Each structure stands twice: as structure tokens, then as C-alpha cells.
Amino acid sequence: MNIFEMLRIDEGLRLKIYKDTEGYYTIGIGHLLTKSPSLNAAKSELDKAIGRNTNGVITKDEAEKLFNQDVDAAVRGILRNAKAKPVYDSLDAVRRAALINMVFQMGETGVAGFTNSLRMLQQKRWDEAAVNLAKSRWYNQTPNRAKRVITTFRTGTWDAYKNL
Numbered sequence: 001m002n003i004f005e006m007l008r009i010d011e012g013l014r015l016k017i018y019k020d021t022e023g024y025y026t027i028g029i030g031h032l033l034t035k036s037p038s039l040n041a042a043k044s045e046l047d048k049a050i051g052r053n054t055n056g057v058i059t060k061d062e063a064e065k066l067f068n069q070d071v072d073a074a075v076r077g078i079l080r081n082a083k084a085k086p087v088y089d090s091l092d093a094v095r096r097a098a099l100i101n102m103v104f105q106m107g108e109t110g111v112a113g114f115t116n117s118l119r120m121l122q123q124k125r126w127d128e129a130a131v132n133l134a135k136s137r138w139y140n141q142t143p144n145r146a147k148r149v150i151t152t153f154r155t156g157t158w159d160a161y162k163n164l
């Protein structure tokens with residue numbers, strides 16, 4: 001298991017524009033296109049990202065390419081974030097993947113409301129952190145996914161992803 005396989009399980013793979021859990025147009029492996037209600041705007045953003053007139057449809061390779069870019073960006077985003085960096089550097093490899101997954105899903109903006117949880121992770125107080133992470137809109141909206149990531153932070157193993 002690794003970050004790519006982990007997110008592929010959590011986000012799935014769709015080759016046509018679809019609406020995510022929050023109702024935003026997305027494609028591929030969880031690649032958000034825009035928060036705008038406009039399908040046209042979404043198709044436009046898609047063409048801009050792929051470099052061609054797609055007609056709201058892409059190939060598997062194109063999806064994987066977007067994915068590679070998106071993971072790289074999340075990692076780079078963490079490294080540049082003054083609050084997240086110290087946490088990321090303190091964690092072991094498995095746990096780092098869990099932090100990447102959150103950032104990929106909710107962005108630096110979302111991860112920003114997790115100040116207290118991040119501090120517990122940095123302190124290595126695993127059970128406490130798991131409890132705090134669960135008191136969030138994130139957990140109430142996407143509980144199954146949140147449970148998988150939380151278990152990852154709690155245990156430091158990929159157990160929640162084995163079977164999927």
C-alpha cells in the first residue's frame with residue numbers, strides 16, 4: 001500500500017464529469033474542476049487542464065496524469081504550509097500518507113480547521129487525536145472515508161485499507 005493506492009480507493013475513478021459528495025463537478029480520481037454550478041464552466045476548466053477539447057470525457061491515462069499532479073501538489077502544499085510542515089516531518093511514513101489524503105480531499109483551507117488535532121498528532125497522542133479528528137464536519141459528512149484515515153493515524157498501519 002502507498003498514497004496512490006490509498007487515494008484511488010477513497011476517490012474512485014470516473015472518466016466523465018461527475019458531481020462529488022459536496023455536489024461539485026469533478027473528474028478522474030477526485031480531481032475537482034470547479035465549485036461553480038455551471039457545467040459549461042466545468043467543461044471549460046477540464047479542457048484547460050487536459051490541453052484539448054474533451055467534451056467532458058477523458059482517458060484513463062489522462063486521469064492518471066491529473067492524479068499524479070494532484071498528489072505532488074498536495075505534498076508540496078504541506079511542505080510549504082507553516083502549520084502543517086512540522087506535523088508532517090514528525091510523522092512516520094504511513095501516517096504521512098494519512099495527512100496527504102486529508103489535504104488532497106479538503107485542501108489547506110480545510111486542514112486549517114484541524115489545528116488542535118494536528119497538535120495532538122505532533123505530540124504522538126494517537127487515541128486522543130483520533131477522538132478529536134472525529135468531532136468535525138468532515139467526519140459527519142464522509143464517515144466511512146474519515147474512519148479509514150483516522151484509523152490510519154491511530155494505528156500507523158494500513159489495516160483499514162486491507163480488503164478494499
Ligand SMILES: [Cl-]
Binds near residue numbers: 049
Ligand atoms: Cl490542473
Ligand SMILES: [Cl-]
Binds near residue numbers: 141
Ligand atoms: Cl464516506
